[PDB]
Amino acid sequence: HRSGQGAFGNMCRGGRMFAPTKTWRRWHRRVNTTQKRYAICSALAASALPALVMSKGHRIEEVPELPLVVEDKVEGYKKTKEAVLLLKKLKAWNDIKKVYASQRMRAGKGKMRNRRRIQRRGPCVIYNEDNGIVKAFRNIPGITLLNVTKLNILKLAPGGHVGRFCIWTESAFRKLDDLYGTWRKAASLKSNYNLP
C-alpha cells in the first residue's frame, strides 16, 4: 500500500514534525543571590496584612488574635489524634475541612500522566527541631512542615498568590530576631545583609 506516498515533511504523514525539540534548550534560569534575598523577604508582613488571607480564601475567622505562635511542646506530640485535638483546641479545622471538601478532578491530559488527584493547599507550619513531629504530621495532607532557616519561595507563594498562613513556634519566633535583627544591624548568623 505504501508506494509513492512521500511521507517526508511536516505536511505529510509522519517523517518529521516541524521544529524538533531541543535537549540543549536553555530550560533553567539562573537567579542572582540578592534577588533571592528580597524573594525570601516580604512574606511575614503580607502573611500577618490580613486582607491577602481572605483574598486567598482561608478561614481567618477561627483565630481570634494571634500571628499564631504556639509553645515548644508541639513537637512533642506523636499522634494524629493529638494533632486533631490540638487543631480543635486552636479551632483551625475549617481550613482543612475545605481541603477535604474541594476534591475536584483535573481537566486535561494529566489524568493518565500520574497527575490525577488534586486538592487544596492548606496552611504551612514551621518547626525548628525534630522530636517526632514529622512522624505525626506526615499522614494528614495540606499541612506542610518546613524548617526555620531553609525556606522556599514556591511554598510561601503557591502559584503566585501571597497570603498563605504560616504557623510558627516559640523557638522560631525567637530565632527570627537572631537571624534578621533590625535595619541598622546586619545578620549575626549570616555574613552580611541589611534590611532595605
Binding site: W24, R26, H28, R30
Partner: protein
C-alpha cells in the same frame, strides 16, 4: 601465557592478564610508542590527557551548562 613455569611466576602475572591481550597489535610496546612520537617537554602539547585522539576530542567539543 599458558605455560606453568611462566604462570607460577608472580613477576609475569601482569603479562598474562586479559586486559593486556595483543599489546603488539595495538602498538603499546617500545616500537609502538616510538613510532608515534611523544615524551616530556614544552614542544609536546598534543599528548596531554589520554592520547592524541582524546586530546583532539577534548579540544573540538563544546560544553553547555545548566543555568548558563
Amino acid at each position: 601465557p599458558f605455560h606453568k613455569a611462566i604462570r607460577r611466576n608472580p613477576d609475569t602475572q601482569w603479562i598474562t592478564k586479559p586486559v593486556h591481550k595483543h599489546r603488539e597489535m595495538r602498538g603499546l610496546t617500545s616500537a609502538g610508542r616510538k613510532s608515534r612520537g611523544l615524551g616530556k617537554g614544552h614542544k609536546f602539547h598534543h599528548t596531554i590527557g589520554g592520547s592524541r585522539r582524546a586530546a583532539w576530542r577534548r579540544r573540538n567539543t563544546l560544553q553547555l551548562h545548566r543555568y548558563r
